[PDB]
Amino acid sequence: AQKKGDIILGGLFPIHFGVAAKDQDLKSRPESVECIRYNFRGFRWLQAMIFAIEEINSSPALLPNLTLGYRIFDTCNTVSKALEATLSFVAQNKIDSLNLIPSTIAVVGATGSGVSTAVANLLGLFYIPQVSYASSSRLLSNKNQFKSFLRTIPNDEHQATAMADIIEYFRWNWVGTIAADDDYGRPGIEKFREEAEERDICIDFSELISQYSDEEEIQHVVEVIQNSTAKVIVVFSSGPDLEPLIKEIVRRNITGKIWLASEAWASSSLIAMPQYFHVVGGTIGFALKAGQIPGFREFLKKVHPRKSVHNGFAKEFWEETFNCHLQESVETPYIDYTHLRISYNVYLAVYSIAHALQDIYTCLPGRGLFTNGSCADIKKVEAWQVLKHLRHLNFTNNMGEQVTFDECGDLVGNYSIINWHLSPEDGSIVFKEVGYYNVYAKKGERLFINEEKILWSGFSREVPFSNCSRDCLAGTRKGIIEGEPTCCFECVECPDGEYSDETDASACNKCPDDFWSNENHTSCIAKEIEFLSWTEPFGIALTLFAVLGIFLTAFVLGVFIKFRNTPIVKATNRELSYLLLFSLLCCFSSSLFFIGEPQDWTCRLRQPAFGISFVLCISCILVKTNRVLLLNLQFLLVFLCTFMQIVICVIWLYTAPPSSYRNQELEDEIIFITCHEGSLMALGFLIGYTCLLAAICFFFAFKSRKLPENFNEAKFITFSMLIFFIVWISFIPAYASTYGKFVSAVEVIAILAASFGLLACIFFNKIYIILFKPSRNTIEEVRCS
Amino acid sequence: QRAQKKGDIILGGLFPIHFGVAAKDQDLKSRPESVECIRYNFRGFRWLQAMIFAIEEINSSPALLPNLTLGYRIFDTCNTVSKALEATLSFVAQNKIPSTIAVVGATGSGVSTAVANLLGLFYIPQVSYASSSRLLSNKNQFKSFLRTIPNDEHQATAMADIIEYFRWNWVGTIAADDDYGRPGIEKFREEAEERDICIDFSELISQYSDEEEIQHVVEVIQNSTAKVIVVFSSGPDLEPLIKEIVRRNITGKIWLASEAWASSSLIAMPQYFHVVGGTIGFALKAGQIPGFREFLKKVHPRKSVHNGFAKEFWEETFNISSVETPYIDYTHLRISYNVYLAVYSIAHALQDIYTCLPGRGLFTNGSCADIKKVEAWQVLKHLRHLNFTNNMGEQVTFDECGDLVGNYSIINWHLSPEDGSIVFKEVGYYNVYAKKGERLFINEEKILWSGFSREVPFSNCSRDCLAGTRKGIIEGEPTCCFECVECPDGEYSDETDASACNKCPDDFWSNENHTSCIAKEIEFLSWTEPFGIALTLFAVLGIFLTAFVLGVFIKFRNTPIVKATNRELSYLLLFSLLCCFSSSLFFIGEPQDWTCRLRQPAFGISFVLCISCILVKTNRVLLLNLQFLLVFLCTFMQIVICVIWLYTAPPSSYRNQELEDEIIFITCHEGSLMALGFLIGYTCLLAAICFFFAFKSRKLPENFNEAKFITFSMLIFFIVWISFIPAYASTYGKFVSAVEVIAILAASFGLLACIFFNKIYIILFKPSRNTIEEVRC
Ligand SMILES: CC(C)(Cc1ccc2ccccc2c1)NC[C@@H](O)COc1cccc(Cl)c1C#N
Ligand SMILES: CC(C)(Cc1ccc2ccccc2c1)NC[C@@H](O)COc1cccc(Cl)c1C#N
Ligand SMILES: *[C@@H]1O[C@H](CO)[C@@H](O[C@@H]2O[C@H](CO)[C@@H](O)[C@H](O)[C@H]2NC(C)=O)[C@H](O)[C@H]1NC(C)=O
Ligand SMILES: *[C@@H]1O[C@H](CO)[C@@H](O)[C@H](O)[C@H]1NC(C)=O
Ligand SMILES: *[C@@H]1O[C@H](CO)[C@@H](O)[C@H](O)[C@H]1NC(C)=O
Ligand SMILES: *[C@@H]1O[C@H](CO)[C@@H](O)[C@H](O)[C@H]1NC(C)=O
Ligand SMILES: *[C@@H]1O[C@H](CO)[C@@H](O)[C@H](O)[C@H]1NC(C)=O
Ligand SMILES: *[C@@H]1O[C@H](CO)[C@@H](O)[C@H](O)[C@H]1NC(C)=O
């Protein structure tokens, strides 16, 4: 393809897919290689270039009086078919200076990354610029290795640093990764694995896909996708690289996932067929921004081979389009496009070169853009002047937006984010635009998404739930790591020690003493303070039993005091019964210390009242016999016997008093307000001295059991000693068996039992002789001995 | 400039005369100019002089290429792609629309894959001499590439097998950014997985790296503990981080080299020795070029017409060839022999073209080419079919892909005391002819580690740990890194390394040492234990005195001491004494099933019969007929209890390992505790019954105050019964059974203290006739 002009532009296009791979034996002269598979889509691209050139030469508003001509060759998407053309561009630029008439001014560049990489090395010698329409490899973006390379497609790596941001507008963690087994899939997954760990995103699985892979490895990948519990899968792959794979996943029929798409396959019709009716439906993809061209659907239609000479490929496109032959409107992916996404790139690149030449044509002679303010002339233009202007480009394409090439050479633009909503008239995979992204601006304003229009899971509406672990409910903590990566966690129930209220907490928290948890680790309610309480009816029942004995003792005092020097009273010593009656009068009241909540002073002196009361009671009844008794020596002996325990009580209360302790060691819910005894021997001495005195009076009472004197008093004294040792021996098993808030109850019942036991035996019969109907025969002063 | 001489057939050439180019950012405000090259290289000039010498020799030898003269055209490469492409255009220019026949070139490897693409279109052959990358091996992408240096796919496997010969685990790597480094290090990372080694850190350096990148690389190499760092890179690329590391005085690392920088005077300097010393690297095979030292000293910049790189060279060496430089200081010829060999390879190609008779056919239908009009596509056909006997005497032929196989040599650096130049003494050969696994060989006493270290260094991630402990715990790390934790008691390890400790045998508990475990001890009072022989002696003495009292009762009979009481009823007390004395022996020894079965009943029946003998002895409230039945009924009311539990719940022997781990304890089981409390209560009740009558009849003086003595006997019995309970509650094993029998022994003597003792005092002493008097009592 070649038409003359004042300024000549080069061009490379992939009209044929691939070459015929013969094995040269080189027995004869080598021959030129053949190309085999015809590309219709590449022919649509070349028609876009011829349309752009005819538009610029038809208008006078841009580049007047300068007819532009093209020279276009067919790369067969191989390097060897490309450099043979590049040696035809490069020649008349500087061949007379290399070796001891049109000149190419720019090249509209090559599709595959390897082809452009090979061509740009040769074109970097002579500083002839090159704008590309499809090359998206990262390594081309070096200004150091390649001097002159410009792109009208943005860099692929930005897709990866776009892609993580979509996740962080929806707040997910768990994700899976599929990459193509190619040169395109590995930079994308490497950069994504960088940015994910940078943004704390954990990836479940990494897999590879190819046309060359076996069906068994595809089955392994199918098992990996079905087994793993991840709701999003990133795919960096080319269009043909999925054609078996999505078909065999449709064989499995999984319909839960929502997919994420790279730029190559997001708009690929080879990755979306209506057989893939709903199972792929709901995904999100990075398309390329498409804008209409007027006239181009009439310019494609108006081609015919023997009518237009300058397009050399028409003579073969006629013959292989519909299968005809020649002597020198139908179903094809030539006419049947529905989005212009690369054809628009070719049209835009040809206008890029057009406005660069315009800025050379109209710069004022005063302030140029070169050394010492001089413009370059237009009828003697060289390549380096055009390159210098072409970095500084800022103009309005007819769509409306600005275009300015970046410092690295990329074109600043907006990736479009699409969703696939099944059009109810169409019933096929139909794309719908939802969100848009900006690579050039700072982070935080790159990505806006309106979420009301996107539909995950086909007809579903709600955001999927794809963390590694479902977050733990209230009453638990975030738990320890389980050997999975750090985004994962387990759920652990809180102990009964502490509570958990705020959701997804790391550790539980405590609370005060006398506040222990309820169940579920809700919070810390109050504990139970368990004391033998007057609010309970059992305590006031015990108090009534205590008061009744005091009243009966007072009656005994009344009948004692009224009858003096009377024949029942006069025999036994008159002060003796008076001293005996006060012993009962205080021993009855002494039981009241063991009821209610223990205060410390009442906890302190409770045992000495017991000790003093029973010591003087047992002493005064032991000195009452008058057989082994004879100033009142009985009174002095009682004083000595009482003071010999009073010394024990004063010493024990001055060296180590008992303490009042809230023993919480018994149970968490119920605390026990009790008393620590202090010195154990101090309580043991007061326990034993009373027992020894009781044994002594028991021995002196039993030795005169039969002898009558004042109505068998020795027998009743023996009975009193018997009931005393009986209740004292019945307290200790009861003491061991009894649980708290009843050991005080067992104590006061035992004291009450001993109290009426020592009350009744001594005095009831004498009360009967003073009170029953034969009292007159009971008391005779000579008699009744 | 360039080198040129006219001839009938011309050859190309590319040689890296300058190391690198000035990195000038281009303004593009003016004419873009041609960049200059930075720092001059002498070694490249020696290589170029080797090629000019080979061409002069071929031109002057009349047996090879007769009567036709070969010329040459050389351009320098400056080790960058741009100057190379500008040169290959000037080769290729005429053929598209004098013609170069071959190109002996592409010293670098990045340059190689561009010059091959641009020469592959026209089918001009290309013979490399130093490019060793593997991507250029295939003959589908590159039609006409041929190497005379071996491929590096052997080198990665050699760098793997050196680890297995020196037994290492932890190693880290860095590579060059070009096609020389990264494919080879991918190959070695592939071959590393089989050998079960661990790769810690991989980093990448290019020659034009900034200060921040080499700062980061020094940080990574400083942090990890790997001694062995493998570097698969060129000469000038590694130079910046060498500047940085020797500025920081890092001293511990051991380096393991590639082919390219293993012998380079750019790095091997006296000033860098305290880092890069002692390293190990591959050097290629030697060669012999005669007549070449003289031809090196025959350069003269006025007389040097045809060469054009002479004059610049003079301005680098003197600003009369005895000045220290790497142009004439070469120990061996390693790469210059390859360039000489490549020029003879093309020479024999054209010689065979000159000698094909018509019948031999290598073109079309058996037709031969012609020398007058020779094309670059025919020389490729003779290049694929080549053999000649080179001047040494081996045979040269190319493989299908293009490489030439050869053995390498591994060398280890040193420091000679003469002038401190780092001297390259060899250690080993790597013969690639033989099978995989019988190639490498390292003589050890010559190889000398960095800092003249005799010992082989340690380079494992984890210390393989002691025989006491065990190692099997991997916390997500690579498997070479592992941890050692002390296995629990009951389990010990008896081998140098294992995943887990085996359980110690039973009747043994694991030692503190954890190397081996020794057996426990059963703790029990024993018959051969002399402390127990004391108790056995007491038992024997008590039995002997019981026999003494019985014999006194036998022979001193008819006496009023004896004849007042019931003469049979005395014998029951003696047999009771013998029985209760004999019953104490069942607690001495290791308890068995029979002993644990019958320990209690013998004591029960013996003591019951003993008390039953003295219940009805007193005949104050008691009077063959009556007393025999009185004993018999209370004997029955204990033997029924005994047979009841000995048929219901026999207590048995029990070995408790519960109390102490290092010493087990053997004791009889409790065995129906009610069926022992019942016997104890029965005994105490029968004791209280006689104690009541003894307290009642205390004052009555009869038969030497018999009732009073009975009261003291019962008092002594209750005294030792009270004394038993804290002694039971206090003592531990091997003592609670000792006190038990001891208590029984005490009680036994108490009976013989009171019952038949003081009466014997009348009978043996002076009161014998007084005791033998029927009037008495
Ligand atoms: C009042 C008392 C001393 C026990 C008490 C109770 C009732 C009685 C009725 C009649 C006559 C004496 C009585 C003595 N409070 C002490 C108690 O806390 C502790 O109890 C004990 C605890 C351990 C050991 C012993 Cl040995 C005792 C007693 N004893
Ligand atoms: C032999 C004996 C039955 C205890 C014994 C020891 C010496 C004695 C000396 C004179 C007369 C009787 C004696 C009884 N071995 C069993 C012992 O382990 C168990 O002991 C007890 C265990 C719990 C409660 C009691 Cl109340 C006892 C007794 N008792
Ligand atoms: C750690 O060092 C030891 C010895 O220094 C090596 O490990 C084993 O050593 C024995 C002894 O010859 C060999 O039989 C084994 O084959 C070695 N195992 C491995 C995996 O090499 C080796 O140098 C290092 N081993 C590890 C696991 O790091
Ligand atoms: C394209 O990106 C620019 C840069 O911020 C923005 O101003 C513009 O609105 C975007 N347009 C579309 C259609 O996305
Ligand atoms: C997923 O985890 C994020 C934290 O990274 C959290 O904010 C979000 O609520 C979680 N989504 C769930 C559990 O659905
Ligand atoms: C590792 O390297 C970093 C910088 O590369 C440094 O800050 C750090 O101290 C080093 N050591 C450790 C143990 O992290
Ligand atoms: C070269 O010649 C010798 C001579 O017989 C032969 O042994 C050798 O194999 C030949 N090399 C080939 C055919 O590659
Ligand atoms: C390499 O070294 C071995 C060692 O003897 C030698 O026999 C062999 O010839 C050498 N060359 C090759 C190509 O193996």
Curated annotation (Swiss-Prot), chain A:
Annotated keywords: Calcium, Cell membrane, Disease variant, Disulfide bond, Epilepsy, G-protein coupled receptor, Glycoprotein, Membrane, Metal-binding, Phosphoprotein, Receptor, Signal, Transducer, Transmembrane, Transmembrane helix, Ubl conjugation
Effect noted on mutating Y184A: Abolished calcium-induced G-protein-coupled receptor activity
Effect of mutating R151Q: In HHC1; decreased G-protein coupled receptor signaling pathway
Effect seen on changing L722A: Abolished calcium-induced G-protein-coupled receptor activity
Subcellular location: Cell membrane
Annotated phenotype, changing T75I: In NSHPT; Abolished G-protein coupled receptor activity
Regulation: In resting state, adopts an open conformation, anion-binding promoting the inactive configuration. Upon aromatic amino acid-binding, the groove in the extracellular venus flytrap module is closed, thereby inducing the formation of a novel homodimer interface between subunits. Calcium ions stabilize the active state by enhancing homodimer interactions between membrane-proximal domains to fully activate the receptor. Upon activation, the homodimer adopts an asymmetric configuration of the 7-transmembrane region that primes one protomer for G-protein coupling.
Effect of F711A: Abolished G(s)-, G(q)- and G(i)-mediated G-protein-coupled receptor activity
List of glycosylated residues: N65, N227, N253, N372, N394, N414, N467, N520
Topological region Cytoplasmic: 563-574, 700-715
Quaternary data: Homodimer; disulfide-linked. Interacts with VCP. Interacts with ARRB1.
Protein name: Extracellular calcium-sensing receptor
Organism: Homo sapiens
From Swiss-Prot, chain B:
Positions with a binding annotation for Ca(2+): I58, S61, L64, L65, T77, T107, S132, P150, D152, E193, D196, E259, Y408, G476
Outcome reported for the amino acid change (mutating E523K): In HYPOC1; there is a significant leftward shift in the concentration response curves for the effects of extracellular calcium on both intracellular calcium mobilization and MAPK activity
Region of interest called Intracellular loop 3 (ICL3), as start-end residue ranges on this chain: 693-708
Result of altering G476E: In HHC1; Abolished G-protein coupled receptor activity
Positions annotated with a glycan in the UniProt record: N67, N223, N249, N365, N387, N407, N460, N513
Localization in the cell: Cell membrane
Domain notes: The extracellular regions of the homodimer interact in a side-by-side fashion while facing opposite directions. Each extracellular region consists of three domains, LB1 (ligand-binding 1), LB2 and CR (cysteine-rich). The two lobe-shaped domains LB1 and LB2 form a venus flytrap module. In the inactive configuration, the venus flytrap modules of both protomers are in the open conformation associated with the resting state (open-open) and the interdomain cleft is empty. In addition, each protomer contains three anions, which reinforce the inactive conformation, and one calcium ion.
Name the record gives this protein: Extracellular calcium-sensing receptor
Section covered of the full-length record: 24 to 874 of 1078
